[model samples]
Target: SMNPPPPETSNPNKPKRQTNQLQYLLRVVLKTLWKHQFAWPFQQPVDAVKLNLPDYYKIIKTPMDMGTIKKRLENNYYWNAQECIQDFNTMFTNCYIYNKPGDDIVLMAEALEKLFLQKINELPTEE
Candidate 1:
């Protein structure tokens, strides 16, 4: 009888498997960014209009900046990929709490792009 293939070894440094869909997606996005060399821009105040996150402008009461959010996500020794996912979770939860939307799924998509992808896309192309 053939024995089953040896069990695959797990990397200890790898992030734990995420059961939460949102968490998983966040991790994926962060990993992609890391692979692309998208360094989170340093802390610097920016105008809301300049940031190009229109939905944020519509929902938020005051002007927001890249620096504040960037700092929160990047201000630690923990891996940037993990930190990004955690920050996204915190941001989404805060928005979801006071949000009037009936379906948060859509809101999450909008928020993800608004908070992360848009900013990443805005960065100059990596050399």
Candidate 2:
């Protein structure tokens, strides 16, 4: 009979979770962007815009860019692999920030739909 395996250690390769007093807000922004597709169509209802700003700002400062999300996800949290994937899915799919129009909209919309499907497939077992 051996003692229980040594206590688990933190995985060095994982992304860390944001905990800078702003993570809650960041989570909200990320969720909202998922909901709104990064403000694509830009004419989202005012309530939607209101809800996303705080979270978005928390995730990244103004002059927002993809690198901000990437850096924050990698440096700020010990995010599990699934969590990291979700974060990237959320951030990259929200391409409306690029400010280009036309086919970008179609591509992002499709991506958002695929993400939604993938997410639904991964819900907690009890749910």
TM-score of each: 0.29, 0.27
lDDT leader: 2
Error of 2 at 92 (Å): 3.5
| True-structure lDDT of candidate 1 | 0.40
Error of 1 at 106 (Å): 8.1
RMSD of 1: 17.6
What tens-digit string does per-residue lDDT give for candidate 1 at 46-105? 233565544543454332222444443333322434444454454445455434675653
Model 2, range 1-127, lDDT digits (tens) per residue? Answer: 1122221224568545544323432454335444564444422311224445434433332232233443454355434445544544544445444324567654665565565455545443321
The all-Cα superposition gives candidate 2 an RMSD in Å to the true structure of 16.6
lDDT minimum window of 10 residues, candidate 2:
1-10
TM-score of 1: 0.29
Clashing pairs in 2: 15-77, 15-78, 15-79, 16-77, 16-78, 17-77, 17-78
Question: lDDT of model 1 at residue 115?
Answer: 48
Report how far residue 78 has shifted in candidate 1, in Å: 3.1
